[PDB]
Amino acid sequence: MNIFEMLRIDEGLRLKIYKDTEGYYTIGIGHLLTKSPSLNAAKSELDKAIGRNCNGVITKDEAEKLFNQDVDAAVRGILRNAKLKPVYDSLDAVRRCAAINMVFQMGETGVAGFTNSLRMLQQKRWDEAAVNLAKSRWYNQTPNRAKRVITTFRTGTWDAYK
Ligand SMILES: [Cl-]
Numbered sequence: 001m002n003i004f005e006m007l008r009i010d011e012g013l014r015l016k017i018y019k020d021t022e023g024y025y026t027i028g029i030g031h032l033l034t035k036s037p038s039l040n041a042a043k044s045e046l047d048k049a050i051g052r053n054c055n056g057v058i059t060k061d062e063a064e065k066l067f068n069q070d071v072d073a074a075v076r077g078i079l080r081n082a083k084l085k086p087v088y089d090s091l092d093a094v095r096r097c098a099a100i101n102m103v104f105q106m107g108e109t110g111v112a113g114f115t116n117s118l119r120m121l122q123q124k125r126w127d128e129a130a131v132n133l134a135k136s137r138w139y140n141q142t143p144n145r146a147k148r149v150i151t152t153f154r155t156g157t158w159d160a161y162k
Pocket of ligand 1: 142146
């Protein structure tokens with residue numbers, strides 16, 4: 001397993017614009033287009049991102065390139081963030097995937113709000129961090145996704161995805 005396979009399982013793949021769990025226009029492998037309610041705004045963001053007139057539909061190859069760019073951006077955001085980088089650098093490779101997964105879903109600023117959980121992860125207090133991570137709007141709104149990510153942090157294995 002690697003980060004790309006993990007996020008593909010969690011996000012799925014759709015080649016036409018869809019709405020995510022919060023109602024936001026999305027395409028591909030979980031690529032957020034806009035939080036605006038305007039479908040026309042979402043279509044314009046899509047054309048800008050892809051470089052052609054898509055009319056709301058992309059190819060599998062385009063979805064995979066957007067996805068690679070999004071994962072790279074998530075990693076780079078962690079490495080540039082003074083609060084996230086020291087935690088990330090303290091984690092083993094499997095747990096680093098769980099960290100990227102959270103940033104991909106909620107953004108750099110959303111994860112940075114998990115201050116208490118991040119300190120427990122840095123201290124390798126896995127069971128305590130798992131309980132603390134579950135006491136969140138994240139867990140209450142997307143519990144199956146959150147359970148898989150939390151189990152990955154807790155165990156350092158891919159067992160939740162196998
Ligand atoms: Cl879920």
